[PDB]
Amino acid sequence: PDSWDKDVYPEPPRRTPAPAPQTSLPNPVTYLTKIFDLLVDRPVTLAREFIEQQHAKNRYYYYHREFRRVPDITECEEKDILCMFEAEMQWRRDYKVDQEIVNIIQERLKACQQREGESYRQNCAKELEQFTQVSKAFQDRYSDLGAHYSARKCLAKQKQRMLAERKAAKEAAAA
């Protein structure tokens, strides 16, 4: 339904075939599902309708909290405690958001694997590629920081990787 964004959690157009009876015998599944409908789905629907009627008479709202951007750890002086504190809080929030991004991608992958059935090895290639890219980026950002991680250690890791990449590029240039 409309509870979630359908672009963040996409699904295929859901093609399902029409019944094609070939036997004169009746279908026990159809009879049982008609009984289930009439005996289960209607009272539950009525209870939900009553509950939603009660809810509509009391409509109140909650809001998503907004955070502005503060200077990063790169723009902080060495011993400036306040700027470091704000930058560290911002970095921790970004870390949580990145974890949730990875979680969304993994949810997509799992759903595709279940959905595609016997053809999952070929029909889930795109989700697997997206997970591979996101996992590589996340591993580059946050892996091996250890317990007691911080923004400063992440910055040191990025600087080390940048130095290695610059050296490799200059050595390949001399080839």
Partner: protein, 69 residues
Amino acid sequence: IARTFYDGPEKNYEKTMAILQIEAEKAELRLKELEVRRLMRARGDGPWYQYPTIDKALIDHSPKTTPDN
């Protein structure tokens, strides 16, 4: 529960800022005091580590029965 028992995040955030400022200033002051103590004890040119010397007011500046003191 939030309305009855707790405050918003800004209170804890800014209280943390104040606490961090106080503690950082105290640490800097401690290091500065140690350095000042070292310098004052090494040179003896400050108010601290002043050890007594003989008072010059004890000297008698009178003729001493001999011209050459």
